[PDB]
Amino acid sequence: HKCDITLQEIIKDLNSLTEQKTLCTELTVTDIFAASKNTTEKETFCRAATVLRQFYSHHEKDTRCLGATAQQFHRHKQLIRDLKRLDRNLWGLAGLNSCPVKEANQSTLENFLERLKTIMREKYSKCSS
C-alpha cells in the first residue's frame, strides 16, 4: 500500500495543478507544513486532503475564481476537477478522517501545492531504487 501507484496519480494531479497561477491560486489554505513536524504519513495525507476539500468546497462557485473569459472559466473548472481528483487520491491514502489541523499560517494554494508535490516526490523516491 505504501508505495502504491496512487503516489503517481497524486504527482500527476499536482503537476497539472502547479501550472495554474490565477486569482484563485493566490487564495489561501491552512499551512499544514508549518507544523514543527509531529504526525504519521497517514495523518499527513489526511491533513492535506482536509484543507484541499475546504478549498474546493469554498471556491468552486467563488466570483473571484469563476472567470470572465471562456479560457478563465475553463481553467477554473479544470482546477476544481483536479483538486477533487487529488483529494480523492489523498483520502484513499489517508485511511482516516480524524486529523484536526491547528496551524495558524495561511499559505497560497499555489505554495501549498508545490510543497505537497515535493513531499510526494520524496515519498516516490524513497519507494524506488
Numbering used by the authors: 1 to 129
What text does the study give?
Interleukin 4 (IL-4) is a pleiotropic cytokine that plays a major regulatory role in the immune system. Signal transduction of IL-4 is mediated by a sequential binding process, initiated first by binding of IL-4 to its high-affinity single membrane spanning receptor chain IL-4Rα. This intermediate ligand receptor complex then recruits one of two possible low-affinity receptor subunits, the common gamma chain (γc) or the IL-13Rα1 chain, into the functional hetero-trimeric complex to initiate signalling. The overall structure of IL-4 comprises the known four-helical bundle in up-up-down-down topology, which like the crystal packing is unaffected by these mutations.
In addition, the kinetic rate constants, especially the dissociation rate, clearly reflect the binding characteristics of wild-type IL-4. Although two "acceptor" carboxylate groups are present, Asp13 and Asp82, the side chain of Arg85 exhibits only one defined side chain conformation in which the guanidinium group is hydrogen bonded to the carboxylate group of Asp82. The fixation of the side chain of Arg85 to the core structure of IL-4 might therefore be not as strong as observed for T13D. Although only a single defined side chain conformation for Arg85 is observed in T13D-F82D, the loss in affinity of the double variant compared to both super-agonists might result from a competition between two possible side chain conformations of Arg85. Since the additional interaction is mediated in both super-agonists by the same indirect mechanism via Arg85, this also explains why combination of two super-agonistic mutations did not lead to a further increase in binding affinity.
